[PDB]
Every structure is written in C-alpha cells, then in structure tokens.
Amino acid sequence: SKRVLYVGGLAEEVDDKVLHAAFIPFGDITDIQIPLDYETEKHRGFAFVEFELAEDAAAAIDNMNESELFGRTIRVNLA
C-alpha cells in the first residue's frame, strides 16, 4: 500500500507517544512500529507510521520530510 511511512533520524528518546503527536495532525493513525535492538533496550533511530488513508500519508510526507524533531532532521518516505 501507500499508507505506511518510514521515518528515520529519530533521537533515542523519541517514542510512540512523540511520534503520534507529530503525525496525528495529518489524519488517523492505525499503528506505529518501532523496531528495537534486542540486546539493548533502545530503538534504532527509525520507525513506521501507518495511516488509515493514503492521502493523509502523502500529506505527512510532504510536510514532515526533512523537518526537525527533538533537534534532529528526520526523513519521511513511503515504506
């Protein structure tokens, strides 16, 4: 589909709550996935945000790609 976004460049403390607040303005979010390093406790700096509507995902990409989050430049593309 074209409803799931790949989001890279996430600071270590960015979590599901942070991601949801940053992306919910574009439309309903179905789920957020944050792959973790099993040995350690933290994530790897990227996540997946799935929108209910492809149209909302598109708007999210257009606005969020190369934007700032926790002082880091993030990259947003179709997963």
UniProtKB/Swiss-Prot annotation:
Outcome recorded upon mutating F48D: Abolishes interaction with KMT2A. Abolishes inhibition of KMT2A activity
UniProt superkingdom: Eukaryota
Consequence of substituting L36A: Decreased affinity for KMT2A
Signal peptide: none
Entry's localization field: Nucleus
Gene Ontology cellular-component terms listed: catalytic step 2 spliceosome; cytoplasm; cytosol; extracellular region; ficolin-1-rich granule lumen; intracellular membrane-bounded organelle; nuclear speck; nucleoplasm
A single BP term in Gene Ontology: positive regulation of viral genome replication
Tissue expression from the record: Found in all the examined tissues including heart, brain, placenta, lung, liver, skeletal muscle, kidney and pancreas.
UniProt domain RRM: residue ranges: 3-79
Protein keywords: Isomerase, mRNA processing, mRNA splicing, Nucleus, Phosphoprotein, RNA-binding, Rotamase, Spliceosome
GO molecular function: cyclosporin A binding; mRNA binding; peptidyl-prolyl cis-trans isomerase activity; poly(A) binding; RNA binding
Family of the protein in this entry: Belongs to the cyclophilin-type PPIase family. PPIase E subfamily.
Task of the protein: Involved in pre-mRNA splicing as component of the spliceosome. Combines RNA-binding and PPIase activities. Binds mRNA and has a preference for single-stranded RNA molecules with poly-A and poly-U stretches, suggesting it binds to the poly(A)-region in the 3'-UTR of mRNA molecules. Catalyzes the cis-trans isomerization of proline imidic peptide bonds in proteins. Inhibits KMT2A activity; this requires proline isomerase activity.
Domain notes: The RRM domain mediates both interaction with RNA and with KMT2A (via the third PHD-type zinc-finger), but has much higher affinity for the KMT2A PHD-type zinc-finger.
Binding partners and assembly: Identified in the spliceosome C complex. Component of the XAB2 complex, a multimeric protein complex composed of XAB2, PRPF19, AQR, ZNF830, ISY1, and PPIE. Identified in a pentameric intron-binding (IB) complex composed of AQR, XAB2, ISY1, ZNF830 and PPIE that is incorporated into the spliceosome as a preassembled complex. The IB complex does not contain PRPF19. Interacts (via RNA-binding domain) with KMT2A (via the third PHD-type zinc-finger).
Record protein name field: Peptidyl-prolyl cis-trans isomerase E
